[PDB]
Amino acid sequence: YEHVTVIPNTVGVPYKTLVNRPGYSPMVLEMELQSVTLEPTLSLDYITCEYKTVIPSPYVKCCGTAECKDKSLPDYSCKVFTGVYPFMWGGAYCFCDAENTQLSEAHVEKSESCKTEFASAYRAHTASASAKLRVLYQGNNITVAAYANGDHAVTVKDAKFVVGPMSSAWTPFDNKIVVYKGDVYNMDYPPFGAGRPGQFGDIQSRTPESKDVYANTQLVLQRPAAGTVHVPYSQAPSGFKYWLKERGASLQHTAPFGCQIATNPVRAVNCAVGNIPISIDIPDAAFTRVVDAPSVTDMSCEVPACTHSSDFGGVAIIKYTASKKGKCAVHSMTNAVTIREADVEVEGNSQLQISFSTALASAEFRVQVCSTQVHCAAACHPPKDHIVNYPASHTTLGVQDISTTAMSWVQKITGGVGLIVAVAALILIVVLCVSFSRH
Amino acid sequence: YEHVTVIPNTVGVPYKTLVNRPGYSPMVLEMELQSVTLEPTLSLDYITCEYKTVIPSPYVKCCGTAECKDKSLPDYSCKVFTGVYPFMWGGAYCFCDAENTQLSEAHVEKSESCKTEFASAYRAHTASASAKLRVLYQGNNITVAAYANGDHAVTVKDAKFVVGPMSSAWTPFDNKIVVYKGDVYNMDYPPFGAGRPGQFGDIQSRTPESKDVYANTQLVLQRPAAGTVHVPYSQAPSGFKYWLKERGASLQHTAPFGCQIATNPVRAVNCAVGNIPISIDIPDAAFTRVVDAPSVTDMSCEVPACTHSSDFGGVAIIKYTASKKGKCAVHSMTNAVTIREADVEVEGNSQLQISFSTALASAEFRVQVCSTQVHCAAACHPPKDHIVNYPASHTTLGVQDISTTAMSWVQKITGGVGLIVAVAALILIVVLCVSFSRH
Ligand SMILES: *[C@@H]1O[C@H](CO)[C@@H](O)[C@H](O)[C@H]1NC(C)=O
Ligand SMILES: *[C@@H]1O[C@H](CO)[C@@H](O)[C@H](O)[C@H]1NC(C)=O
C-alpha cells in the first residue's frame, strides 16, 4: 500500500498521520523531524590572508649613482636618493659627503601563515537538502536518513520511504559568501584582481599554495633619516587582518528562521520553512484485517478537567467495551486537537485515560478508535504561564474558533428585524397593488 | 583611460573597436574570440554498471528437507524443490527416489569492471564561463584568458582587461545528465533506489568503490531439469549494458548552436549566443598626442572594383598627402562595412590600397584615418559561389539596404498626386465658403 502526506517543515514536533485501508485495521504513524540539512554549492572564488613585506638590504653607494631595474614581482617598488651621509657605530660609512647615493626597493609576498589561517570567498548559489526522520513503526522508534529533494528513496524494515522535495526553495545563504575558520558571512567581496587597500580582498590568492598572487598596497618609499642607514617604507596597512576586527555579526544570528550553520562541510540546519511531502509504501504484513482487531462497544467519554496549553494539558477518560484483548489505534480527526498517544491495548468492558493538547477555549471533538467514533465535550481554562521554552506547534488554532457559551450569545445576537421590515414592505406594496399593477 | 564595448558572442570573427581620446591619436583595436568554455556544476547523483550474479553450489539433500534462512543481501532469493533425482557421471547421486530435496539461492553484486567502466549520473544545474581572447596591441597579437562572468580582471602589458558577464544565461546542458567514458546525454534518470529493470539505473551504486548497492532484478528460481544436478536462474537481463546499445545521438550533435562538449572536466565550448561586454583600462603610454601623429591632406578615394562577399572582396585605392612619415590608424564608422587592416604607415604625397568586406549592392561609405574623413562610392557585383565553409559575420546587412540606382526609381515613384487633390479640395471648399461660413 502507498500513502502520501505532507507535514510542516518543523523540528521536534511529533506529527500523527492516519493511514487507513479498507479490509484492515487503520493505523496511525508518528513522524518526527530530527534535523534537516541544506548543503549549498561550493565554487571557491579565491582566498586571502595577511601579507609579508620583503625589503632586502638597501644598496648604498659613494661617488657614483645607482639605477632602478624593473622587477616582475607583485607591487614591486624602488626609489633612489642622493646626498645621504649615513653613520654607523664606528663612524661614517664613507667619505663622499654628498656625491653618494642610496637605492632602495621592496615587494610584498604571501605569508606561510596562510597555509594555516586564511579567509576563503566562495560563490555558492544553489543547495541540496538532507534530513533525518524518526518513525513509530510496529511499536518502536526507527531512524531514517535521506535527501529531502523528492528523489532519494530509502528501504527500512520492508517499507519504502520517499521524502521531499522541499516546498520552499528559500535559503539563508547568498550567491557570494566569505568563510573564516568556523564562521560564515554574507558579504559581496570585491572582484579578483581589484582589491581595495585596507579592505577585504586587499590581497588575492587563487589557492593557499599557488605561488602567483595579486596585490595593491601603494608601496611608496621615502628619503631615509639623515645621518642614519636604514630603509623607510610606506607599506599599506593590511586590510585583511583589520576585517577580522570589524567582522560583525555572524550569519548564525542574522539568518531568518535561525538555520544553524556548520562548516566542513558548510550546512544550514534546523530552520522551519515550508513543508515536506512524504510517500510511504508499506507492505501489507504490518496491515491487520479488521476481523483480527477486537471489536469495540459501549463508548462513553468524560473530561474531569482540561487546560489548553503548549503541553498535553488535556486529560480524557473513556469507558469502552471490547470483544477481546488486543491493540487498537487511536486518533483525532480534527486538526484543532492532537493526541500524544498512538494506540492502546483494550481488554473489554474497562476504561482508559488519554492525554491530549488543544487550543480551543471549549474542546468539542470526536475521537476515532477501532473504527468507531466517540464525542468529547469540555471547557478548558487558561494556564498561568505566558511563555515556555520547549517548542510545541501541535495546538494550532485558526481564525475560526469556538465562542463556547458566548457562541449562543452571538447566535442570539444574530436575530434581526429584517424579516419584519420586509413583511411591512410587502404589505404596503400589495395594499398599493390595488393601484400598482406592474411598474 | 577606460573604454567599454560589447561584441557578438562569436568565434573566429575579428572585431574592430575604435577607442578615441581627445588630445591623442585615436586607436582601433582588433579583438578575436579563440574559444569560450562553459563549465557546469557537478553534483554526482550516482553511478551504475553491469552486475554479476553469484549462485553458489546448490544444497542437495536426501530423505530430509532443507530450509530458507533470510539473507540481508541485495535481491537475495531462495527456493526449494522436492522429488528431484539427480544423476552424475558415476550414477545417481543418492538413493532416496523422491524423499530427497534441493535448496537453491542466489544474489547479485557489483562487478569489479565497474572500477574501470561505468556510467555516471549527475544533476548539474548552473555553469561558469571562461574564454580566450586575441588582441592586436601595439602591432602584435597577444593572448588573454579570463572567466567570462564580469568578475575576473586580468593584467597584461600594463593594461587591465575585464570580460563578461555573458549576456545570455542559456546553456546546452540540463539539470540532469548522464555521462559515459567520453559521451554526455541529456536524459532524466530514474530516482535512486527505484531502478526499473531492463532500463538505465537498473543497478544503483553511490560510488564505484562503495560496497552498498541497490538492485531490482526479479531473481526467480525454477525447478531443475529432471535427472540432472544444476541450478536454473531467472536472472533479469541487465538494462545497463543494453542502454549502451540504444544510447542514441550524443549532445555534441543535438546541442543547439553546436557547443562542442568535452570531458574531464565536462565543458561546452564554441557556441554563439548573445554578446560579451569588455572593459579595457589602457595606460596613456600607448596613447600618442595628436601632434605626434603626422598630418593628412589631399584625400581622394577610388574603387577599381568591388565584390560583396564573405571575404575581403572589396579593394579601395586612396591618394593621400601627409606631413611626415608615421603610423596612422584606419577605420570605417559605418557598421555595414568592415576593414581587414587596422593601421598603416604614411610617408606623404603617396597612395595606398585597402582590402575590405561589405554587403551593400552599392557601397557608399566614409572612412576615417588620421582624424580625417574620405568618401568612397562603388557598385559591387555578386560573386559566383552561393555557400562557403569558413565563417564570416562581419558583413551584416539589416532590413535597411541601398537600392542603389533603383533608389532614385523609388524616389521617383514616391511622387504622388495627393498635393493636387488637396489643392482641388481647398479650392472647392473656399469657392463654397461664400455660403460655407464655419460648419
Ligand atoms: C520513542 O521516543 C519517545 C520519546 O520520548 C520515548 O518516550 C519512547 O520510549 C521511544 N520508544 C518507543 C515509543 O518505542
Ligand atoms: C596576428 O594574426 C594574424 C592572423 O593571420 C597574422 O596574419 C599576423 O601575422 C599575426 N601577428 C600580427 C598581426 O602581428
**Secondary structure (DSSP) of B61-80:** ESSS--------STT-EEEE
The rounded distance, in Å, linking the Cα atoms of A37 and B207 is 21
Residues of chain B in contact with residue A72, where contact means CB-CB under 8 angstroms, are: none
Closest chain B residue to A152, measured at CA: B192
Work out whether the CA dihedral A401, A406, A407, A411 comes out positive or negative: negative
Distance from CA of A125 to the nearest CA of B (A): 9
The rounded distance, in Å, linking the Cα atoms of B348 and B325 is 7
Contact at 8 Å (CB) between A332 and A349? no
CA of B142 to the centre of ligand 2 (A): 10
Q: Burial-class residue B346 by CB neighbours within 10 Å (0-12, 13-18, 19+).
A: buried
Bridge partners, residue B51, by sequence: B110
Q: Which ligand is closest to the CA of A136, given by its number?
A: 1
Q: Which residue is listed with cell 562553459?
A: B38
Bridge partners, residue B355, by sequence: B315
| CA nearest neighbour of B66 among B104, B106, B105, B103 | B103
Resolution in A: 3.9
The rounded distance, in Å, linking the Cα atoms of A300 and A372 is 12
Taking domain A290-379, whether its CATH number is 1.10.3720.10 is answered by no
Does A141 contact ligand 1 (Cβ within 6 A)?
Answer: yes
Query: CB A403: neighbour CB atoms within 10 A?
Result: 12
Grid cell locating B233 = 536462474
Please tell me which of the candidates B43, B152, B153 has its beta carbon nearest to residue A128: B43
Q: Burial-class residue A142 by CB neighbours within 10 Å (0-12, 13-18, 19+).
A: middle
DSSP string across B118-177: -EEEE----EEEEEEEEEEETTEEEEEEEESSS--EEEETTEEEEE---S----S--SSE
Residue nearest to atom 14 of ligand 1 (CA): A140
Q: Burial-class residue A322 by CB neighbours within 10 Å (0-12, 13-18, 19+).
A: buried
Torsion, Cα B163 B169 B171 B177, to 10 degrees, reads 110
Please tell me which of the candidates A128, A152, A192 has its beta carbon nearest to residue B153: A192
- B152·A194 Cβ contact <8 A: no
Does A143 contact ligand 1 (Cβ within 6 A)?
Answer: no
Q: How far apart are the first and last CA of chain A?
A: 67
Which DSSP helix (H) or strand (E) runs through B251? helix B251-254
Q: Burial-class residue A299 by CB neighbours within 10 Å (0-12, 13-18, 19+).
A: middle
Residue nearest to atom 5 of ligand 2 (CA): B141
Residue nearest to atom 10 of ligand 2 (CA): B141
Residues having CB closer than 6 A to ligand 2 are B 136, 139-141
- A43·B128 Cβ contact <8 A: yes
Residue nearest to atom 5 of ligand 1 (CA): A141
CA of B406 to the centre of ligand 1 (A): 93
Residue nearest to atom 1 of ligand 1 (CA): A141
Grid cell locating B427 = 479650392
What was the experiment behind these coordinates? cryo-EM
Residue B34 in 3-state DSSP?
Answer: strand
Q: Amino acid letter at B332?
A: S
Q: Between vectors from CA A43 to CA A204 and to CA B274, what angle results, nearest 5°?
A: 95
Q: Burial-class residue A354 by CB neighbours within 10 Å (0-12, 13-18, 19+).
A: buried
**Strands, E assignment, B247-361:** 260-261, 268-269, 275-281, 296-305, 314-322, 326-331, 337-339, 343-346, 350-358
The rounded distance, in Å, linking the Cα atoms of A230 and A95 is 18
Any A CB within 8 A of B41 CB: yes
Query: CB A25: neighbour CB atoms within 10 A?
Result: 21
The rounded distance, in Å, linking the Cα atoms of A196 and B414 is 63
Which atom in ligand 2 lies closest to the alpha carbon of residue B136? 13
Listed by the residue before each break, gaps in chain A with C–N over 2.5 Å are: none
Query: CB B102: neighbour CB atoms within 10 A?
Result: 23
* Residue B431 CB contacts under 8 Å (≥ 6 apart), including other chains: none
Choose, out of A44, A147, A152, the residue to mutate when testing the contact with B (most B CBs < 10 Å): A152
Q: Amino acid letter at A177?
A: I
The rounded distance, in Å, linking the Cα atoms of A247 and B398 is 55
Contact at 8 Å (CB) between B191 and A151? yes
Please tell me which of the candidates A126, A193, A194 has its beta carbon nearest to residue B126: A126
